[PDB]
Paper text:
RNR is an essential enzyme found in almost every organism that converts ribonucleotides to deoxyribonucleotides. The first-identified and most-studied class of RNRs, the class Ia RNRs, uses a diiron-oxo center to generate a stable tyrosyl radical in the radical-generating β subunit that travels >30 Å to the active site in the catalytic α subunit to remove the 2′-hydroxyl group from the ribonucleotide diphosphate substrate. In order to respond to the deoxyribonucleotide needs of the organism, class Ia RNRs have two allosteric sites in addition to the catalytic site: the specificity site, which determines which of the four ribonucleotide substrates is bound in the active site; and the activity site, which acts as a general on/off switch for the enzyme.
The 4.3 Å resolution structure of Neisseria gonorrhoeae class Ia RNR in the inactive α4β4 oligomeric state solved using the chameleon with a fast dispense-to-plunge time yields molecular information regarding similarities and differences to the well studied Escherichia coli class Ia RNR α4β4 ring. In particular, when dATP is bound to the activity sites within the N-terminal regions (i.e., cone domains) of either the E. coli or N. gonorrhoeae α subunits, each α subunit interacts with a β subunit, forming four α/β interfaces and an α4β4 ring-shaped structure. Within the N. gonorrhoeae α/β interface, there is density for residues homologous to the E. coli class Ia RNR interface residues, indicating close similarity between the two structures in this region; additionally, a similar amount of solvent-accessible surface area (495 Å2 and 575 Å2 for N. gonorrhoeae and E. coli, respectively) is buried in the α/β interface upon formation of the α4β4 structure. Density for both residues S41 and H25, which have recently been identified as important residues for organism viability and drug resistance, are visible in the α/β interface region, suggesting that the compounds may act on the α/β interface region.
Numbering used by the authors:
A (entry chain E): 281 to 346, 374 to 376
B (entry chain D): 5 to 738
C (entry chain C): 245 to 373
D (entry chain E): 36 to 84
The structure:
Amino acid sequence: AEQEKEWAAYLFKDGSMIGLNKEILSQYVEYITNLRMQAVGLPAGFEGANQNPIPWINAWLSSDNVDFE
Amino acid sequence: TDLKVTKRDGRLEAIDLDKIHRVVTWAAEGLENVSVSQVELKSHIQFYNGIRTDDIHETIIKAAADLISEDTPDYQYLAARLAIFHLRKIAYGEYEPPHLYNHVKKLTDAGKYDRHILEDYSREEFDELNAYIDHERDMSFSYAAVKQLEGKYLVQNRVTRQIYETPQFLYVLVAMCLFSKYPKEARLDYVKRFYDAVSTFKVSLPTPIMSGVRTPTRQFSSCVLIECDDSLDSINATTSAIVKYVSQRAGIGINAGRIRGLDSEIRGGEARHTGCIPFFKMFQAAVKSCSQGGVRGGAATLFYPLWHIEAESLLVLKNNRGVEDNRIRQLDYGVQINRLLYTRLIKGGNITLFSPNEVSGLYEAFFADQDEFERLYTKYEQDPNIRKRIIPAADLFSTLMQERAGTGRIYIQNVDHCNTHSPFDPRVAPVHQSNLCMEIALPTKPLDNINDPDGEIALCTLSAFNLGALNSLDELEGLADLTVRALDALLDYQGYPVEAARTSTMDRRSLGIGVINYAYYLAKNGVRYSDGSALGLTHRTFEAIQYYLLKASANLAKEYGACTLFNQTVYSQGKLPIDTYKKDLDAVCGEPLHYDWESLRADIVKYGLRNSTLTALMPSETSSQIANATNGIEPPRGLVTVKASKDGILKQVVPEFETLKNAYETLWQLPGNEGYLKLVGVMQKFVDQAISANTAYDPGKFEGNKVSMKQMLKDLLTAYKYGVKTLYYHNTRD
Amino acid sequence: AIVKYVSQRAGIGINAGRIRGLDSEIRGGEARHTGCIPFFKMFQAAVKSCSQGGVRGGAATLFYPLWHIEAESLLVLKNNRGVEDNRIRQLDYGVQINRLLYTRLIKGGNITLFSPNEVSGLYEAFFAD
Amino acid sequence: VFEKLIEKQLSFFWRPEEIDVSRDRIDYANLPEHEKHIFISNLKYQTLL
Ligand SMILES: Nc1ncnc2c1ncn2[C@H]1C[C@H](O)[C@@H](COP(=O)(O)OP(=O)(O)OP(=O)(O)O)O1
Ligand SMILES: Nc1ncnc2c1ncn2[C@H]1C[C@H](O)[C@@H](COP(=O)(O)OP(=O)(O)OP(=O)(O)O)O1
Ligand SMILES: Nc1ccn([C@@H]2O[C@H](COP(=O)(O)OP(=O)(O)O)[C@@H](O)[C@H]2O)c(=O)n1
Ligand SMILES: [Mg+2]
Ligand SMILES: [Mg+2]
């Protein structure tokens, strides 16, 4: 996980970009790690485990996966 | 290339690659489930060279509030933060306003304010009071608030839109201006209470008072009344009056049920030139004039009695399909009704309409008594040689109800209940009309020309205290103990265009106030509207403010003299409005009388002579969004309210949506209007002036998806039984 | 005055060429609320009233100068085919003309209309020198 | 719950030349240098992995 995080710096230490530069992608990979590891049996290595830092990606990724008163 | 933009100053900036997420992170610094990437991407903005960062903020906030729903209704606070940020930018550019002086002393000569505040206070205590308004509380609004605020709530040129104020200095500025004529020994320690009240959203204020405070044009009323009798000079005078008065934030209750029929002219000539049809065009064109102060367009509301020889044949004037002879659809028509007309319909009597001026002692008798009124009504049915028009009540009522269901704007006033519960004395000066919003009443005298003091028109002034933003009702007294006092200084401070309007409003000093939020307090209580658990649940605390506001008024006016016309009031006799109600059974929502403060009325008869009116219940539709409350007493259309106006499409949310997701009830889920009727009748137990009620149906719960004719008539009748106040929009649902 | 006087066999020469343009409001507010279009409805309804003594129906006649910033775009108000925004066909409209306007047309000068109240010493000068 | 289903689920088969991908070259020139750099870096990482 730390190796992938360190990798996600070289392709970004040249300039900004819309959508995600360093913090959004870091939160995304941390959440992906924490969500994927809790499917084989292992203590959670990252705390928080909050909402998906980028939810629209779930829109494309294999929605059809396998009186008188 | 040269990826530059027009920055705040005008110089060519960078490519806006970085430093763009900084503002959205500043916004969502303590929120949750907010998709910063989505809102930064779903903006769908064009990136052409030659854009201004102000326009970029405008479009990103236009796209921010667009993507909102009950799924993630969280970053509306983010939209509000961005809004107040852009506002503070367009105000100064930086994020640090001056110390209340460099802004006030530097902009006083700009003419937007009144050139007396600086001459009414001291520079020394100015800075002392300045260190009490840290703007950190300004980050608690909603987008639905800042939207209307930037639209029309604060001082700004209506052609340039260059805003020159800040929603934080607003409250303290109005609280300082309202306390000018006061002893210089406690005002400094007294304004802080009012500021803490208004800033914490505990007390709500309308546009007429927040759109017009500290402004050179000193006008602060909310509604006015006027009635015209059979005279040309009177018609010219009232036309001049409506043309001149509506130009400053006015509300009109015009009444012209005493002009003429179509019988004849004595001294030779036509009767009335087709009657009221051409005459009402004058009033329609008059009310269609300059904006009411520069915020919106006013709309008056006329009235006429049902027994008019010109029958409901003119009532079609609000219908859509028809010739252009008489179809003036620009007003809110009104018709009068008493306790006998519905009885004549139930018995089946064919009502015979007649001419007002052709008979004597009938129009005033329509409001005065019953014996002489009935005797005359039958004596004419007996008198042959006078020209009338008879028709079965069924056809007339059916046409009226069809027109109401079609246009959805025809209002009806219950004159019988308009006197049997008013604090005035219905023996020397009864009521005759109501304002366009149908929540107030006061005597009115016609006039021959505006320059004469013979005539007299009246007005009022509103305010609102929240119900739900509190923790315990006990402190409410103190709250009241401020606001009415403040409201006192409001009366002797404003100006009056009509020379005759000054005397009546300086004498009676009529004043009524209400409430904004209703659903949040009911949900916090724990009862709904359908079953009826709220039929008496609101009689525990809400039944106490109406009786304890008089206590505050007495304690705050026991030494401020007396009302020059206090003798013309039923409450001036010695009986408090604690049991003077004509309920159906007086026990439909039976509960013990919680606060029978006879010492209050004792001290009132002793020396207590306060403002004539006490309170009211206004819908406060344009208001109540500054604090993000429920619009009036009516429940919301849904959990999230999608509203539309000339600005765009807004999406407001009800408070406590997270912890009370399913705790309210949508008006789409309440088919029985009997619950709403019982609720407003329970409110009738302590209402002072009136309530602006409303009904609504749904064609998805009828036989053939078509409206009925007796079920809604039954609802009207059971509303006429108990809890009998004005009517309003039919409010169908397409 | 028009409401009271027309009721006895009267003939009206109303003139309102000095009301306002559509520029702005000094003390804060809209310029003129679309200008003369809503204001003239008042006069139109006023003259449409009781018979002039009981014999016939009177009909007034308004006037306005050609150099008004609100140009002949409002002159269409007497036309038949059009929307109901401003088509009040109940009056006898009038327009002012001098010795120079026709000359400016003959020479071909594109007349530039302007606001009456925004400038000083122009309306009376239109009749003086 | 194995290849008996998941290998039987591989029915999404598709020819890569069967799709139309032509707008790439028309929408690749006018772009920042770093954008193309990171795009090619991602493509290389994907193909190598
Ligand atoms: N890098 C950028 N280039 C151009 N506009 C930008 C950029 N970042 C943001 N904007 C938009 C949003 C800002 O509210 C607006 C300019 O506001 P401004 O405060 O002057 O930007 P700034 O914070 O970079 O300057 P400064 O640091 O001096 O305050 O333009
Ligand atoms: N020129 C008119 N001819 C006929 N009726 C008119 C005329 N102008 C107005 N009316 C309508 C509205 C007036 O209230 C009513 C006449 O009453 P009024 O204004 O007092 O004049 P009047 O005294 O000459 O007639 P009357 O004796 O009937 O009151 O008829
Ligand atoms: N367009 C309108 C609407 C209402 N009103 C008046 O304002 C009251 C109801 O409107 P409101 O209380 O929602 O106005 P705000 O205080 O919300 O700005 C009634 O007394 C109306 O007569 C008005 O003057 N003009
Ligand atoms: Mg900045
Ligand atoms: Mg008369």
